[PDB]
Assembly symmetry: C2
Homo-oligomer: 159 residues x 2
Amino acid sequence: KPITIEVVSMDWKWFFIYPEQGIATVNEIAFPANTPVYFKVTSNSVMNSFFIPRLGSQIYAMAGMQTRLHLIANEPGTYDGISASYSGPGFSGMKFKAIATPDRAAFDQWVAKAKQSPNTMSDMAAFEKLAAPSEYNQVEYFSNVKPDLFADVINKFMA
Amino acid sequence: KPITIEVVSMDWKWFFIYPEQGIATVNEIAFPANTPVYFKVTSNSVMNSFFIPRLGSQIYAMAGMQTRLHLIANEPGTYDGISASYSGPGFSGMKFKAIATPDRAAFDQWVAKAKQSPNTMSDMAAFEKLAAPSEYNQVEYFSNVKPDLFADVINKFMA
């Protein structure tokens, strides 16, 4: 029933991981409406803001630390997500999309469309490649992800 | 008499600017011993630590904010500078060098060796190029720098 999503604000794009489903995406998340969505958030750069106005959901993202946000979307639809309003270039294109699908079958189907992507997120080398400075990043799916990649990222900023 | 140095911890290297002299360098600073050195510090990435153990000098570097450290080196020499001990790769090669030269004539001469570099730091485009992810960066000089480049960097993380 509850969906867990791991968020990592990279330089000028958002990266999302679906620990239970085995996928990861960039600038786009989906989940069934009227369902408990569980976000684990962290930054891999400067501190940021995981903000979805329409859903009254805001949570900071900071390197070295994992924040949490619990969300329920009651009406189906696609909500926009914005990031921190820093005046710097690159932050401006740092938006993402929240697809609160009409039901779970629709969610299941979105996973399936992801599991069909050729490109994966299997190791940290792949991680830093994606992590490299990029503006206005387009949506992207990854049919496979390294098991504890969220943890691995936090450990980069431990002491 | 007092020397002002602007510090910016980039991803896995240190960048230094000499506002009054007109130069900038990477992983290496110099100043005459027994002279007041004035550091303005900021980060362009995660928070860091501008640390020179031998001189009992530590100051955090944070994006959006300018910290300050006042230092006097009494004995001439070259002191090592280390950064924050995060467990992440890239941080390990984030070291720099503190040349507290025997006197000012020697300092003046170090400027001169810098003013002779072909490569400059004239605009923000040049800034982000340097700013791009790079490990074990070697020392480098820039004979020219954009006047208020430190300010320009802080403004990237204003709201």
